RNA sequence: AGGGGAUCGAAGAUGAUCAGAUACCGUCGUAGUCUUAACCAUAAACUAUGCCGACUAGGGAUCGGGUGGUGUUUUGACCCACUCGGCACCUUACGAGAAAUCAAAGUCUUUGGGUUCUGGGGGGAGUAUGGUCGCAAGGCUGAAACUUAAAGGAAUUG
């Protein structure tokens, strides 16, 4: 949200959940950022890099967030056959 | 009553866990130690405390009592924590599987010494 | 003076964290009252109401007092508490504590052209609380706060300064109806609205940068 | 307010449940409202049981047994010991003791 | 007084200025 | 009975999208009901659709993402003069910077600020925002 | 949907059973009915 | 991606199906449904070894992530799980809450028993639920050990496992503890095996 | 109005308790209880919850029908999986509510799927009067003068 002239004057931008792209509020205190280590040839992690994710509160509470983070993880190339489309 | 207060239970219980060594199963002896150890205000309450002393370390010969903890059961204790058989239960002492169990192996493609029993309700 | 107990507060003296969006932004929990005020020194605190209460004993009425606190910035920032204890004075002294531990921010939009600053809300929201329910919707330049009393005190404290409310349910609860409208104003955030569909890449939490610094 | 979500009784799906008469104090209560026991005992009672089988012309003679089933109204269930006021949490069982 | 015996006092007097008026008509 | 099936296809469209889902089925097809989701999807709001043929009004499928906060219609289909667009908008719009009304024409299905350009006006539908 | 009918056509059934539900309010029947003339001891005046 | 050296060796399926690992409860909840492969007569669901694997792997990849080992937190209520638990804490830096589940570890920023975690794993949510709950608080993710049939609201990684057996729950902690060591380097090389026995990690009955 | 009339039993009669007991308790006992023909049209007639339609969370048990399993005992009975239509039940809160609670009482200030019925502080009053139905008891429709600051719902501590 900017002004007149092109200043932004929007305190902050909010983050949004990765499987269901909603608003991450100030004060939802279920919601969680996961960091999946990333590796060398060697097989051995890389300091302080990773590949995050966001899930919101509500997805959690539901239990849809073990299957959400397979989705997600799968695309992404961090798992093989955990997650198939067609259920 | 003979119930004893937190006042005499906790303080006896302090004693054990610092002075095991020394504490006897003999309320004369241990009533001079009380002495030497802690500082307490009264013949009446000194007695009392070396009193359920004495009670304790006779519970302690018998097998180890939940809430009270010293240097030498500890020791014990982990000792015992580094147990591990000579072969694991895991190897192999010829591995059995059912005919499901079997369809799964082919699946994910491994090969493995596969010995198939009749299942059923 | 001040000795942190917690990984934020560590890191607020330490001033790896400046402002308080990043709190928000990642959603951290606030429980030390000393952080929020490290961050925003300039806030200004109002009691709504005082009321008394009682319980029944043997011995007649044990009677203690209930206070009602707002705390705000007048720039985005507000909060609401509710203590009770048995005197007066103590009741106020815990409340400004207990609100300024739940400060949350707003969004302020246009109600029109994009003319000039911020002076109203982005879009209507409501809020509930009881059986009372307070919304807010914009209103053009020199509106003013169209608000009873006890709600306009929260709306001059938070910020916006064009904004039409229309309440519903039995008002006269004072707490009820604070509640609902704090309620309604930080709900502000949590609409999605076009200007926002962009994918903006997840920021790394301030809590996993400074890991050294936030153990002790 | 609603104290019970079963109305204090078992009838779903029906409109209509003939009716059957307390033992102690013979007042009408619906079948399926009644609290009902079964009691079962020997004859002869526990005490007697030597006695008896010394006085058997027979050798092995099983004690017979009497049957019958018992329905109280509330009134006298709750006074005869057979039910007592139940904790609010403690209403919602229902597996015998 | 119980709502059940009201409304029976009530039948009881409706039931004699029935008949009071019974003998003008 | 089935009284207006555009009103049910909004319906689970509304329920999914507030309970995560990304997808829905809505049945039965019909041409008003393509009109209006070829609207939310012009804005972005909706995302691919398919139609299922099966010789009986049919079935659709769509892809939904997290942007639909409420979609659903005004029934009856009220009259509106081109002067009274001002006084539906700024009754079931979050904002008068964002949202749209679907109103019916003779030009067509169309939302009302290509109603304005046009300078047409008719029934009005539904709306999305 | 609610207790009402939102057809198009059904304007008669809104007009007619509002007309029949304003009897409740204690204004609309003391007014219509005139009870002022009737009973009042002033009759509708200010003063007497 | 992965090198292909983390495919699922046969080493390792002789273990995990010895273990019965991939015995599953009777009964299975929907969203356990994509871990189970097949369903034996009299009912038992096998669970698919490749996806416990797999998993596994993941979770332990968000192990490694966190910097100050001491911030990651094992609970385990339950007796077959309890040295299990100490041993994962000992071999690498987690903290572990082993016996019964102090309510206000995660809350109350006052008591003696205050963790501030960064990730916590528990062996059965559905015994460990206090720990679970209170992680919804103050976000913080959850990592468990889930049979089919167990409960997964406020769960992230799921490792599907038999969760009733004394073999099948040591051997997955054990497991895990191997992959976090090697991630970050304390093992050489992932070819070889690990020369610490899974018995270590089974709860002995006397 | 005929028939039947064993049991229980408004009325009635009695014995006892009691300050009184024209009540509870004990024993008698007519109308009634049951059937045929014809009236009445009522109830806490209750799920205190209108009907048709779509959508939204998890788990097991049961009634009817159908499909697959040559399952097992000697396709009848069972057993396992699936499906349609019912009577319900357990857990939970995305949601609703003033709460008690509720898978509908949700998809309602982000207010519109179709439709019918009813209510507007508490009393006077479901009373008076006028109609209409009934053999009668009575049913349906149903006011006004006057009076009043509270009646009332769900939970909390005593």
């Not at chain 4, 019970?4 to 307390?22: E, L």
């Not at chain 7, 056509?9 to 003339?37: I, M, Q």
């Not at chain 8, 983390?6 to 994509?34: I, K, M």
């Not at chain 8, 690498?92 to 920023?109: D, K, M, Q």
Request: with cysteine; charged share 25%.
């Amino acid at each position: 949200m900017e002004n007149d002239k092109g200043q932004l004057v929007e305190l902050y931008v909010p983050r949004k959940c990765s499987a269901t792209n909603r608003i991450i509020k100030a004060d939802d205190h279920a919601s969680v950022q996961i960091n999946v280590a990333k590796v060398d040839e060697e097989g051995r992690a890389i300091p302080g890099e990773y590949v995050t994710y966001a899930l919101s509160g509500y997805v959690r509470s539901r239990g849809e967030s073990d299957d959400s983070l397979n989705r997600l993880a799968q695309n992404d190339g961090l798992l093989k056959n955990v997650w198939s489309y067609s259920r | 009553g003979r119930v004893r207060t937190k006042t005499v239970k906790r303080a006896s219980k302090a004693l054990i866990e610092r002075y095991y060594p020394k504490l006897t199963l003999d309320f004369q002896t241990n009533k001079r130690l009380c002495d030497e150890i802690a500082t307490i205000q009264s013949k009446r309450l000194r007695n009392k405390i070396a009193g359920y002393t004495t009670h304790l370390m006779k519970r302690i010969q018998k097998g180890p009592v939940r809430g009270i903890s010293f240097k030498l059961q500890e020791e014990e204790r982990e000792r015992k924590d580094q147990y591990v058989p000579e072969v694991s239960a895991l190897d192999l002492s010829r591995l059995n599987v059912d005919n499901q169990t079997s369809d799964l192996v082919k699946s994910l493609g491994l090969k493995l010494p596969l010995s198939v029993i009749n299942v059923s309700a | 003076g001040w000795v942190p107990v917690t990984k934020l507060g560590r890191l607020v003296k330490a001033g790896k964290i400046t402002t308080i969006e990043e709190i928000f932004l990642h959603s951290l929990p606030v429980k030390e009252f000393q952080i929020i005020d490290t961050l925003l020194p300039g806030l200004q605190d109002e009691v709504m109401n005082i009321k008394p209460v009682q319980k029944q004993t043997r011995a007649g009425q044990r009677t203690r007092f209930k206070a009602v606190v707002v705390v705000g910035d007048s720039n985005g920032h507000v909060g609401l508490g509710i203590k009770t204890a048995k005197e007066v004075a103590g009741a106020i002294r815990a409340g400004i504590i207990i609100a300024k531990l739940s400060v949350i921010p707003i969004r302020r939009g246009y109600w029109g052209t994009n003319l000039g600053q911020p002076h109203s809300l982005a879009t209507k929201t409501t809020g509930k609380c009881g059986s009372v329910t307070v919304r807010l919707i914009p209103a053009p330049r020199g509106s003013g706060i169209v608000a009873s009393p006890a709600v306009k005190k929260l709306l001059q404290l938070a910020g916006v300064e064009d904004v039409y409310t229309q309440s519903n349910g039995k008002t006269r609860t004072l707490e009820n109806t604070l509640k609902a409208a704090f309620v309604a104003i930080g709900n502000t955030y949590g609409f999605l609205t076009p200007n926002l569909w962009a994918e903006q890449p997840l920021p790394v939490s301030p809590l996993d940068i400074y890991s050294d610094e936030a153990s002790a | 307010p609603k104290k019970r979500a079963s109305n204090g009784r078992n009838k779903k799906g029906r409109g209509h449940v003939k009716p059957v008469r307390c033992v102690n104090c013979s007042k009408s209560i619906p079948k399926d409202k009644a609290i009902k026991r079964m009691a079962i005992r020997n004859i002869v009672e526990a005490a007697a049981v030597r006695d008896l089988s010394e006085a058997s012309v027979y050798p092995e003679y099983a004690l017979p047994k009497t049957y019958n089933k018992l329905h109280y109204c509330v009134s006298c269930a709750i006074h005869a010991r057979i039910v007592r006021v139940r904790s609010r949490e403690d209403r919602k069982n229902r597996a015998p003791p | 007084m119980r709502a059940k015996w009201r409304k029976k006092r009530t039948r009881r007097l409706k039931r004699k200025r029935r008949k009071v008026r019974a003998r003008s008509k | 009975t089935r009284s207006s099936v555009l009103a049910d296809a909004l319906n689970a469209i509304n329920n999914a999208e507030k309970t995560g889902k990304r997808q829905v089925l809505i049945r039965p097809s019909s041409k008003v009901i393509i009109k209006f989701l070829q609207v939310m999807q012009k804005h972005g709001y909706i995302g691919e659709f398919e139609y299922i043929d099966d010789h009986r009004s049919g079935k659709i499928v769509v892809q939904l993402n997290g942007r639909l906060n409420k979609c659903g219609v005004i029934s009856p289909r009220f009259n509106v003069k081109i002067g009274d667009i001002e006084k539906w908008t700024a009754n079931l719009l979050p904002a008068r910077q964002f949202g749209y009304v679907i109103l019916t024409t003779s030009a067509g299905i169309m939302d009302h600020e290509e109603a304005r350009r046009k300078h047409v006006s008719g029934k009005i539908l539904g709306f999305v925002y | 949907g609610k207790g009402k009918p939102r057809g198009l056509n059904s304007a008669r059934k809104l007009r007619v059973h509002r007309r029949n539900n304003r009897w409740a309010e204690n204004n609309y029947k003391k007014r219509l009915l005139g009870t002022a003339f009737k009973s009042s001891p002033f009759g509708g005046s200010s003063h007497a | 991606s992965l090198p292909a050296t983390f495919d699922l060796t046969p080493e390792d399926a002789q273990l995990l199906l010895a273990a019965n690992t991939h015995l599953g409860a009777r009964n299975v909840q929907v969203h356990q449904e994509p871990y189970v492969f097949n369903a034996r007569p009299d009912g038992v669901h096998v669970i698919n070894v490749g996806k416990t694997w797999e998993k596994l792997v993941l979770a332990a990849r968000i192990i490694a992530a966190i910097p100050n080992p001491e911030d990651v937190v094992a609970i385990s209520s339950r007796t077959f799980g309890q040295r299990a638990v100490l041993k994962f804490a000992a071999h690498t830096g987690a903290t572990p809450i082993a016996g019964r589940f102090t309510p206000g570890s995660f809350t109350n920023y006052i008591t003696r028993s205050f963790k501030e975690p960064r990730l916590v794993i528990v062996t059965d949510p559905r015994s460990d639920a206090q720990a679970i709950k209170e992680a919804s608080y103050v976000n913080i993710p959850v990592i468990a050990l889930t049979d089919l049939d167990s409960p997964s609201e406020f769960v992230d990684v799921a490792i599907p496992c038999n969760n009733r057996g004394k073999h099948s729950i040591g051997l997955i902690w054990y497991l895990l503890a191997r992959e976090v060591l090697r991630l970050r380097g304390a093992l050489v090389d992932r070819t070889q095996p690990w020369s610490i026995m899974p018995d270590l990690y089974f709860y002995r009955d006397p």
